[model samples]
Target chain A: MAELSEEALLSVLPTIRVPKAGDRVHKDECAFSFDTPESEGGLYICMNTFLGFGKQYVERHFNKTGQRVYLHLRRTDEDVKIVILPDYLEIARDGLGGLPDIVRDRVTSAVEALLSVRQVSKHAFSLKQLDNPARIPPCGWKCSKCDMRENLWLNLTDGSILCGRRYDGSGGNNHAVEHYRETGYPLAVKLGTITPDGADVYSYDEDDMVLDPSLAEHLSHFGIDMPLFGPGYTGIRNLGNSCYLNSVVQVLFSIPDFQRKYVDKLEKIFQNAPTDPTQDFSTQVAKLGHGLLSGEDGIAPRMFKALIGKGHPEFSTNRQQDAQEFFLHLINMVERNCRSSENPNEVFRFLVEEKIKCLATEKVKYTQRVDYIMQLPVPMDAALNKEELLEYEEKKRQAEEEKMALPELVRAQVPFSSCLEAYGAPEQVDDFWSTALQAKSVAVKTTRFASFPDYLVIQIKKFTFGLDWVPKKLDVSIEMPEELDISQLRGTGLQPGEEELPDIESVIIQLVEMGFPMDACRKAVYYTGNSGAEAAMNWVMSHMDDPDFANPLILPPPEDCVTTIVSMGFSRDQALKALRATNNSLERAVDWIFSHIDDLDAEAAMDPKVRDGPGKYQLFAFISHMGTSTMCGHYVCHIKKEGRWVIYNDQKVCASEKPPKDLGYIYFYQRVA
Target chain B: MQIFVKTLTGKTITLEVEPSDTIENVKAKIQDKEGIPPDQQRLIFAGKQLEDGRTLSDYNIQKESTLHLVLRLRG
Candidate 1:
């Protein structure tokens, strides 16, 4: 929040190093580089070809905050500026065309001096050398108490080594530091940094990056906190033995979309509802979302169990019920309330509704979908060998194998896209598609764009009934990919033509933005026939110089219509076209946007800023299990909040520098919007 | 207080301890009884992680209920 002074910026400038050839710097190492190529030779630093100085220092500054260090160069009078992005230090020059050579020469020398660092001391140390106690050079010392080299070691006035801060008698005594000072300890080591004047400067071996106060202040301006539970999330206390419900509630609270939709609808749904019965499920479920979002220490969803017990009977006792069972019951109640509510909103509809068209042999069934999916048989077993793992590499290989083993009553149910599609026929089966139908073919029942919701909640079927009659965790690792494409699984009516479009409409919109008419844009894409956006773009450019070409740049409609839709609670440059489609009527335009909200074809038409590029799913959060069975184990949630991974253990929250490596009950990912 | 702990192999081991004893102390006893390192042991009771420094009474770990033990698979 504090501004950096000129003196502060200049003081820290010397620490910034430009990497050079033969340097030990790796691409993964946290160091900033210029964006421009080395051969062009402006003011660029290339990580691919150069190594940086102070590997430890560079990692400490950049890796912790995950922030890039930027450097800017400017000419005194010409308005010329050279901007640099440190992550991939590429130098881009702007307003440099009119600058004279004299100012440029001084700028180059100053930058060069900034990149070159002074060598006051040449100290060498390696992990291998640390293993040999005899290799502790003349001035070097290892920690006698901790039996470690580097960092946390301090040399005292008595010439004895200590492993902690200067000992204060009243404060709790650090065992290693106190014991080492009184009686000789082997873990103590003596080390010193020497100045150019040959004076030994002895200081505590602190591993923390000593950031310049000025640079730290400057960086603070850019540091942002993601709207995660910062004060820390409120946990649902275990009512009797309600840990299962508590775990499920914690995960549900993590979802941003669910919080947005359900939390906002809480008062509206529960306000006038009948609470006199006390067993009203809708009123109780509505209260649950509200309590979780209240930011209170802990909430007891006692009403939930009271209502659930009325129907299930098993929940009457304070026994540890299955999370999956409770999850389904809770979701069903929410969905039923949404469908039967008096004051329903679009967000509520989006959260609870999805159309699933299923085909089992000759039967084609249409059903209202649930909040999350339960995965079917994936061809994996404890007996599966290494060679068999490779067999399912290709889609056709899995398809053939699935066809042979497909059950007589094979079923396939697929959700339209919200999250990207991950698996093909081979990696998974039955849940989304079945390779069955040797004689009797599987077919679509019906279709609509409403099948696709804005957010996806996938419940990986990690727990299943075992020999013990109780559900157990499946330790099998299911490979989940970043981008998931389920175009093959979508039902009919989604595609009007025999084959899908080459995403021509999206490409046409791009050409339209380049001052071409819709008619010209369509013809250009038709000629290219889904060759892709690049080929169609070239086609439009080449035709522009032709004598027949004549579309002029038309001014877009006023912000009036866009604002009107926002007010109408419908949900963007693409507004005028939607208005254009509805003949400039606000009421009709609002309806058009809502109807095509989930329409992949009408995506660009709904929003001018709609992403037509490749979709990427970055992992945001995941739940991890710490035992062999899901029935009896601990569950913790790890979230990528504000560029740092934070672990949530019920009410306890702590920053996790290294996230969990293994999979568990479920994983949640968000599209990189 | 006495509680049952089920190992990964489904073998149940019964142990007696005071309510004031820490989970770390229990892990040390398990190391002696089962030959598993205290650091490698992960104990879960009442569907929650039993922190090493916290007393058994803090988690309200009841008598006769099963506590799950999973050893770290790798370093």
Candidate 2:
């Protein structure tokens, strides 16, 4: 190969065309996918601490604002030109300069700190206490009397117990409720007054009962026993179409038009409507249509909305349940037993056996348990039980107390290290806190802890209706070990102050209190004309005003709403500058003297007197930006326009892009003929 | 099915799951995990391990999925 000089290499560059606006271009690699080693630069993008890439061209800081200069790379063989965006507010974190080079690293660090997931395998760990329904079943305990499971339901509606034992259907009339109504003997048992040991009796009140606790428990016997009085239940049907609705709706919503049109319409009508792009009307309508079409598979026992207000889903047979398996059984029953109804007794008995069997069996196709859980009403039976109630009350108190003690304890736990002390102040962390005393407390007894941390573990018995996001922990740690300890922790938990006024007020107070104003005392040694206090004393001493300073409104010569001291005459600029300079008191200082004006006039007379008309117009220009009144004062001038002195005060003006191109003068002057 | 215990805040819920169940099963587990009744709970699972029920097995995920119940956490 022939040797190529730099000039020959330069000659080849001219043959290649730089990409223009319309040219099709593709990058050699994804802009965010570039890989440069740390020695070259650091990671560019780390989405959720993954997919990290490093390319310093997009990573370096763009000077003063500490913003990074990221480029949407469109490359050609010979050149790589970065598209510089306007002022970078859209690109910058706050619409200032570009993003800082540390952007990705900081984001990864912050997210990592937040994502703490802890799991407990089946080791014999101590148990966390249970308050609702009084007992938290040991992880694997079976009941003695009945085929009872570990978890039990304490009805919040009225204090009653619903053990997770499925009703054998044979226990029907033999249960506590049936016995209580028949005779007063089992009244105490029906009242759910038993303690954790199921031995002690406490106060019971039927009058206080809102709903029978055992009703939910009884429903559980029907394969519906679920934890009660949890977050309030909604009346939404979980049907076969839930999947299709989720999928199709998501796809339809991929476009903003279909997803947000209804919400935007509703919002136009009312501001508080839901606006998540995904939760559009088309989605909701599809949900409703799916619910209606799904029939029995769609019906939930405890749907929040009263869709079929008075009537229920039309059932083919009363002997069959309006459940999933029953729908399947109805398929079999209608096929086999529909005609057998002509032979009522045998088919009816068969139907009954099948229904109970279907309800009891945990077949994947049967939706009985999930549906039963849905049906369990709020205000659980145990929610009313005084013993369970007491436990909850205790738990609640501890949670509240701990909630309060959290920040204090957190601040106490990891004393910000000496290394952190040099780095920065410990950032104020807005860890959650609570003081809800009115709420009925749920007892939380943890087997996990040898000793409770000094902070509270807040348990919200009930979040205000419709309000969600009850934090996993009502209490949170408030330590900025990072900012003080390491650069990685700089902004973690370092919440910004919320209110502007407090910062402003604090700054004002600090400035005033600091010797900034008091330093003037030292400067006062200049023996200047008068200090503010001295000026006041001089005025008072000169006037000899009355020293009687009680409510003096009734005294004569009462000034009109604080004396209106009119400003003294001075050139417009001098007037405004003086007004601002002397606290609106124009008499303190003189800026322009007759000596300076005389010198300027002498120069003006000698300069061949370039006839620029009367010079009063300069006065307007000087004062235009004065006193915040951008409109300058107009002056009456004697101008010789076309050999006549014209008087022009009012003039029509056209809109302008820059300064006016022409200054028009009118021409009706007093001619001395 | 081997059961797993997921903790959210302080509450621990028992999730008895089988092989046939998908991560959607994990979502159902979350209902019990949070102690929020099925009707009141809204579950969102995003991130690589379990973004949706489809790309689930591709994650070569642990035999058991980890669930942390998120109650509004907002006041």
Candidate 3:
């Protein structure tokens, strides 16, 4: 393969934004704006704390035969040292866009070398499957408009070309797909740096640390892909899919020496035993299973680090790779803690138990083991509590999620005083907006605004009015947007921006990454509303798609209806009926109930509906038990609000369940449909 | 009284020749938990799928023998 040109290498090098000599950027103040939106006309840049971690762009070069070719690379810190080498590149340049002539030539040369290093993984849990290597095809496809329809090209995966499917070895679409699969992705490596005290030394600083790239390479040989993922991972990380296949690299890195240790220990045991088959005591098979044992502490990442560092010159240069030492070093560090009675079984059991705890509790997500493993602050004596750690982790996660929810630029809040005081000049242009702008309601806080295609995102903070009467249904209704028809005002305060906006791309990207096809997801989003990206995504996921998208199982429905209802921790009867009227769906049912809950509240408020309106003890219960008026089913449970379902551990019900768990209560009831 | 549960992959599991209903009845119970259907179910023993109507006696069925069930659909 041809090498990277000097200019190209410099162009792809990451621009570091670290503080220069005592000018340390405050960790919290490390905000960056590299996630450029498609409309903003910026390149796909991966930024971490203001550092340009990567840049995604296409390059072009020509092959030895003078045939033009394209190559794509997600270049990072280490990849820069290799100059223009093809072996280090990811992403085929030809797959995306126009490429320069020289880059095309250089890319063609390296294409062959890059072909040998393709990687693929499968999603865990859902599919419970992995992509078979044999299933991959070769790359090489002539452009439909190219003069030479039969021109030869290279397939990176298996190195075969399709000449229009004629088997003459000319490139075609099959080859293009193969090239895209193999070259258009990163070479993920997993690194496990263990300290003998069973701590992942790399993460000793701060929290949730990962391995350095150097130690990660040796660990990668064991099948782990470090950096957790390659370039552009954070920008477009695929959730809920390919988890296991992706984990294979990291898993391999974590326990590389463990497998070899098994072999070595088994051999030693076998040789020492009596030669006679019948008389020989062969614990060889079981002896190497130290990590699998109950109480003994097993090898840590530092141990593997030192073990692999033996032959490499980098390790010999300095015994200390970073702050931590090798395996032998780790063994010494943890020597004080290693008890005489402890066995491998105990050690393995402890590790497995800790792993399970981290995964189950919110302390660590399933795919974030590397971060948790490295950053886990389990001391020599006290183990990390799953509950406490999880609580902190959940807090951190919520903070991050909230940050993601915030729009790029919040529309400046207009003062309630500034809202329209003079009544309608035009309802669309003046009256409705004016009323919304100035009308005094019960609770008034500054309104937050976001713009929709045809409307404004004006959120007024409302304060609850105190009331003494126990209402089953309604004293007043929950306030929604003061929506007015657009036709009401043609002029006034309204300004025209984008009338025919592009389809919501953020929602499209997220759904597609979640394994939904474009058309189906588009249909579901269109069915919900033409709202902002985040809301549209939530609507599709919460209301439309089944829990398991890749594979779907039929859920049991009410006796007469066509809709199916999965468990939301609700009982059969109330859920069945409320569900049918609400299309046998949990989200719709909850929305319907909450939208008209004032009726239920109103019933308890007036003496006509209840015997003792002011003294109703279970008014809240009544609110919860109200099913949709049109549906048919048995009673299931009482839900005070839609969020109650989530506080009870049904997160799929609503986005905000964390704060309400201890604040309220729900009860279940069962009867005929 | 013996019934077999099958999986989509043609793995079969045999329950104790529980002195209960017919093979069809056993299939219903399997469907309830594992979601395997009666017509599409296969009996797998030691990782091999058994053909239609294979009985407990054929595989030395005894009290408390465990097997796998694989579900399939007609081609």
Candidate 4:
């Protein structure tokens, strides 16, 4: 309350009255059900009470600046009214009586957001005007030089309004560029995008969005007082179809490891920096982290995008991209360049240990290989929940009256556990030629983890038709658990008293004795299977110069990956490179093929390359798609930050109420210690 | 440099060619991949068909630029 003076307190806080028994109004009079299970006969007087903005605040703030708020009041036999003391801003948190803790946290963030937005831009204070005012026409605006009047730009320097250059798909013809060329005027404001709060100001020299320091003074010269605000962390500006890049970046830097590696200690990264920032990968990543975190209205991630997607022509073009594929590309680049540095990408790396036991010889081989993510298919047949699916069908019936984007579908809402159980189920491989048994034998293949990663990425597998590399989406939703327990899913490697097949170490020793480095030896043995020495030697000799030879072993290319990818008419080499780059993510390799098909130099990628307790993880973020396929969708990310779920759109960000965790295509969870 | 050609059957055919190679020569590589002759292969890039005599440099096709291949109806 002390934060505001007697005169200023009421002005800063909202004012409103609570009508008696507002909830008991008849249906025809007020459509509100009022009997919400959580409400428990109590009603919140104002959505604006916390920050004073809501359905009630909308009407209240609609009429005036600081909107009215009704602190929730309990409905009881005795009529009750809220008596909020004036200038009591700190009561915003406490006064939210009966508001759920989650709702209270969100309302608190509202004030934080309020404090963030109330600022004067640096340029507004630092810039000065010469004040050489010309007879600026207040109306009948047209280009000073040309007759075209539509997209006029005002020169804050001399009040010369001109129709900006004719846009030729990208930019206008000669006028704007000519103006900058003629006079060294650095800034101009576009007429159409300008609002009372701020306007689209461009520095022709800087070649990007810039703040108008003397915006108020300049606008007043033209008979308008449009003031711009802020120098706080704003979202990244979308370049054509770069939402994939933005959402990917939004969730990425928000991560703790990435913040520590790229943003917190950024100065250490560029201490011995190169003259060209693009020359160093870490430099550009650090610069990007700062660009995003810096207080710009928005950024055009030009340098970073260009450098990261340097060799791949597909990414540089203005087109839709697969967020998942782009994420892998970023990790690959980050992992390769930080050979000696502490890599945050390592947090996503975990080992998958496969145990295949032959029934004939009573023997099994324990094979551990590195994997980064899991793609589990929704077990539609054995699911336990159907609420989302039932509701979607009701929508689908109406959707059929008028066509909707959702495909023909019929499914049940499945618990996330169903998908996990299906993926973890043991498989029977009959008639397998076991080298140990030396004959046809039956084997049961089971997968368990050799290590638990600090982070887990789960993508719900969807079905696609036509094999155009575009997958389809069902409006089907899953019950995503905020907390997941995977303790029972762990692999028990090499049980005592169990017979074993020929040791993979035996093959590793043979290769190591041949003078090959342990990384190469171990990698070769894994890639060629345990039946080795000669086959491993041949693979090493053939791939000596290959980027992955020196790199450590990973899950040997998934079985039949070559034939499957090759069936799509790609060459064997393309399939191999695609598989390794994708970490054996089966069908997604097609994207890798498109991304790398033009690499004539065949600069084969550098190479492929945890913990315990209840396997408890808290869902921190999820990436949702709005279209039918990976290649043709819009992506948005919802992440947990500042005790609230916030959705990050391309350049627009907001607090997400009841985030769509159930419908997310990809979920990111962080293990809790 | 190399450019990718996506075929009607949804297969991506990668062709390695020099800048001086005419569209005709480029289609020859596609013919081997698709089992269709150059005369029957009609390739389009940036919504324009490649003229038989024009070299790839004339079209200014960027490395890795995708070209769509449609079969000629009445060649």
- Which candidate tops lDDT? 4
lDDT of 3 by residue, A1-673 (tens): 5554444443543321223344322111001112112212222212112111112211111111111122222222211112232333434334323566655455444333332221112211111112222221111123333333333332212223322222565444443334335554211211112222221211211222233334332222222233111211111111211111112212221232433433335545434433221122222222213322223212122222223334444333221121111222222222212223222211111010011001111121110000001010111112224455446556656765553332222112222222222111111111111111122112111111111111111111111112331111111112111222222211222224512111115667778888766665675556556576666666555545322222222225545332322222224454454555554555445433322233445765889010111111111111111111111111111122322321111111122323321111121111111
What Cα-based lDDT does every candidate model obtain? 0.43, 0.25, 0.27, 0.59
**Which residues of candidate 2, in runs, are more than 4 Å off?**
A1-174, A178-260, A266-673, B1-44, B47-55, B58-75
Regions more than 4 Å wrong, model 4: A1-233, A383-411, A440-442, A465-470, A502-614, B1-75
- Name the 10 consecutive residues with the lowest summed lDDT in model 1 chain A: A120-129
* Interface RMSD score of candidate 2: 35.7
lDDT of 1 at A605: 62
Docking class of 1: incorrect
lDDT of 1 by residue, A1-673 (tens): 5333323323334434454444433222112221122212222222222222122233332333232333332223222223322333323333223345643444354344434322221111211112112212222234555544333333222333334443444322253455544653222222333222222222122322221212222112222011235333566565655655666666665566556555666545444443131345544555566655555445556656666666453466554455545554555445434432332222112211112222554322222322233222223332234454344444445654453432222111222231122222211112122123222122332222223333333444444334633334555554444454433544333333333211007888887888886766776777677888899888777654332212223224557778866544444544555676655766446534533344434664677111122223456666565554443455666766667777766555668886753354456555455
Clashing pairs in 4: A48-A52, A48-A53, A123-A213, A166-A172, A166-A173, A232-A295, A451-A610, A452-A610
Instruction: Please write out the lDDT profile of model 4 over residues A442-494, one tens digit for every residue.
Output: 66666676767778877666433233322235445687898888777777789
Cα lDDT tens digits, model 1, B1-75, are: 344565554345556566556789989878777776676576755224455566565444543344666332100
Error of 1 at A376 (Å): 6.2
TM-score of 1: 0.33
| DockQ-derived CAPRI band for the predicted complex in model 4 | incorrect
Better of 1 and 4 by lDDT: 4
lDDT of 1: 0.43
